[PDB]
Design an enzyme around this catalytic site. Structure first.
Site, PDB file in Angstrom:
ATOM      1  N   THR A   1     -65.166   7.237   1.602  1.00 59.45           N
ATOM      2  CA  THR A   1     -66.518   8.194   1.579  1.00 59.45           C
ATOM      3  C   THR A   1     -66.288   9.749   1.469  1.00 59.45           C
ATOM      4  OG1 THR A   1     -67.104   6.464   3.263  1.00 59.45           O
ATOM      5  CG2 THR A   1     -68.334   8.567   3.258  1.00 59.45           C
ATOM      6  N   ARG A  29     -71.418  -5.883   1.497  1.00 59.67           N
ATOM      7  CA  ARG A  29     -71.393  -4.963   3.014  1.00 59.67           C
ATOM      8  C   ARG A  29     -72.135  -3.599   2.782  1.00 59.67           C
ATOM      9  NH1 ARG A  29     -68.586   0.101   4.124  1.00 59.67           N
ATOM     10  NH2 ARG A  29     -67.778  -0.061   6.314  1.00 59.67           N
ATOM     11  N   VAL A  30     -72.792  -3.183   3.457  1.00 59.97           N
ATOM     12  CA  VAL A  30     -73.391  -1.972   3.496  1.00 59.97           C
ATOM     13  C   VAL A  30     -72.807  -0.974   4.833  1.00 59.97           C
ATOM     14  CG1 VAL A  30     -75.597  -0.403   3.491  1.00 59.97           C
ATOM     15  CG2 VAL A  30     -75.349  -2.736   2.357  1.00 59.97           C
ATOM     16  N   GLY A  31     -72.390   0.023   4.589  1.00 58.24           N
ATOM     17  CA  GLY A  31     -71.809   1.134   5.752  1.00 58.24           C
ATOM     18  C   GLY A  31     -72.928   1.853   6.326  1.00 58.24           C
ATOM     19  N   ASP A  32     -72.462   3.273   6.565  1.00 55.79           N
ATOM     20  CA  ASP A  32     -73.305   4.065   7.342  1.00 55.79           C
ATOM     21  C   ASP A  32     -73.875   5.296   6.329  1.00 55.79           C
ATOM     22  OD1 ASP A  32     -70.386   4.875   7.345  1.00 55.79           O
ATOM     23  OD2 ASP A  32     -71.081   6.767   7.919  1.00 55.79           O
ATOM     24  N   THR A  52     -67.710  10.006   7.938  1.00 55.74           N
ATOM     25  CA  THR A  52     -66.878   9.222   7.146  1.00 55.74           C
ATOM     26  C   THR A  52     -65.983   8.533   8.125  1.00 55.74           C
ATOM     27  OG1 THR A  52     -64.713   9.133   5.694  1.00 55.74           O
ATOM     28  CG2 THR A  52     -65.163  11.310   6.938  1.00 55.74           C
ATOM     29  N   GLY A  53     -65.611   7.163   8.067  1.00 53.25           N
ATOM     30  CA  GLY A  53     -64.923   6.355   8.780  1.00 53.25           C
ATOM     31  C   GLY A  53     -65.468   5.041   9.124  1.00 53.25           C
ATOM     32  N   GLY A  55     -67.800   2.159   8.998  1.00 51.11           N
ATOM     33  CA  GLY A  55     -69.351   2.310   8.736  1.00 51.11           C
ATOM     34  C   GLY A  55     -69.903   1.650   9.779  1.00 51.11           C
TER      35      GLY A  55
END
Ligand code: NA
Ligand code: NA
Lengths: 134, 156, 159, 136
Positions: A1, A29-32, A52-53, A55
């Site tokens: 990210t 998969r969808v993160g933050d 970043t991290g 998600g």
């Protein structure tokens, strides 16, 4: 990210985030990063944030919005709020990562709770730094 | 004006970080700061600044966005991006895409061309094409280290 | 003691256009949903089971814009989103842009329980449905004449 | 959009939301329903929430999380918080919709700023109600 937050000559804020996600992630998969209030956030009344991290942890805690909320509802500084969420809240849920953020007065904070975070800032003075670890 | 950037908290461990890689990393971050600095210095918007900065981070193969994007379980790229402007909380975002050279420029195209703040799949790519954004093959995005990262990770 | 609350959307028909038959039909549908969730809680089931079964019921009811009686996209298809979340640990699962799974909320739950993810899209999401052995339906099952007419009228009023 | 929130006998909360989206929607558009902290939310320390309305407004304001934040940070009641966000905040940015929510003590609120919201609740007593407009 990866991400960036900016404060304009007029004190206007913006944030942007982009990611390839997570290595060997399950397809779909969808993160933050693409979820405003989680990984990306900007309000000229408070701060602009790019996270970043993990998600999932950032989505579950709504990290970016929590920091905006703590500034608005408790009158906290960007530093106090951002440090609390990344230092304590993110740890408590068992998540790793960090966050670049700039408030409406131009204060920059880059907290992280892990080994390091590729990061940098440049001011209108021309003054610049980049960092990996300390 | 001020600009802050990151290239991820997924940093290379200290014991694997060489002096050459450290220098290369700071060089990449420096080029990104310059991209965003040029915009702000020229009296451009906070939105232009973070767009150009993130486009630079996408272009840099050391960082997990656009080129040098990590690989999925099935050896493909799925890239997510978002912009948000603090004046009106206007926003645009995409998730699960591959093709647009600079996902963040698509995220921005969504904000500017639609009334939506998040779009996925072929609908998102249709906006990229409307906005005349550049598309690239999987070769462009490919970096050996990310590919090896996947192959090592799949050893599990 | 336990409690359950439900909704079938804020996109209600205006009161002046609401007939006594449709009003009765609507309250009947909501009643069936409450019973589905009540049965779970009454039987000592989890809050998660209660909201899953309630939302599966709302999906099954064609008067409500989820599963069956889902509205149509500009291109005359269904794109269905769903999420569950458990308050104990803020554990969650969600899907977006799905079509086929009879009960999207059961997929959202399959994501939470079978993966470490809280949101999944496209074919990856459908792959979890199949793994979880969830029921798939044809486009006809989801189709309701009123939603189809709503689309055609909505598109006509953009000309 | 449809949804449900529940509180079990021990005060454990959960929420669920499902939607077919929006009539004549652009292919690819994602609203608030599948985004935790926007349209769906549950924390046993505060409340469970399921929203319905203009997805973009709910995403921009992080409506579900804002209500959790107001309860945690200002000690507000679910009613005060939920009514403020749907009544005032959502109105101010020109968004329409509503929200069912149950707090950790079992208080149920179902605010909306539009014509109506198909809704109901059933208690452990057996006591039940359904609504469309302001009345039962
Ligand atoms: Na990159
Ligand atoms: Na339905």
């Amino acid at each position: 990210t990866v991400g960036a937050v900016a404060r304009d000559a007029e004190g206007r804020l913006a944030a942007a985030t982009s990611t390839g996600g997570m290595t060997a992630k399950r397809a779909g998969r969808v993160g933050d990063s693409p979820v405003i209030g989680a990984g990306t956030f900007a309000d000229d009344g408070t701060c602009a944030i790019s996270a970043t991290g993990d998600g999932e942890a950032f989505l579950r805690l709504s990290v970016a919005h929590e920091i905006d909320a703590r500034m608005r509802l408790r009158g906290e500084s960007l530093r106090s709020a951002a440090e609390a969420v990344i230092g304590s809240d993110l740890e408590a849920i068992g998540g790793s990562g960090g966050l670049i953020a700039i408030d409406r007065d131009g204060a920059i904070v880059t907290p992280y709770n892990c080994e390091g975070m590729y990061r940098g800032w440049v001011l209108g003075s021309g003054e610049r730094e980049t960092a990996i670890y300390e | 004006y001020s600009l802050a950037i990151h290239g991820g908290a997924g940093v290379l461990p200290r014991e694997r970080m060489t002096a050459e890689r450290e220098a290369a990393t700071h060089a990449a971050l420096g080029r990104v700061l310059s991209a965003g600095e040029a915009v702000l210095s020229g009296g451009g918007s906070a939105l232009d600044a973070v767009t150009e900065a993130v486009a630079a981070l996408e272009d840099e193969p050391l960082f997990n966005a656009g080129r040098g994007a990590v690989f999925t379980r099935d050896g493909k790229h799925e890239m997510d991006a978002a912009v948000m402007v603090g004046r009106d909380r206007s926003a645009g975002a995409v998730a699960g895409i591959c093709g647009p050279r600079n996902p963040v420029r698509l995220a921005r195209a969504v904000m500017e061309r639609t009334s939506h703040v998040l779009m996925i799949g072929e609908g998102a790519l249709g906006i990229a094409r409307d906005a005349g954004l550049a598309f690239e093959d999987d070769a462009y995005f490919f970096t050996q280290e990310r590919w090896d990262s996947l192959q090592e990770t799949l050893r599990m």
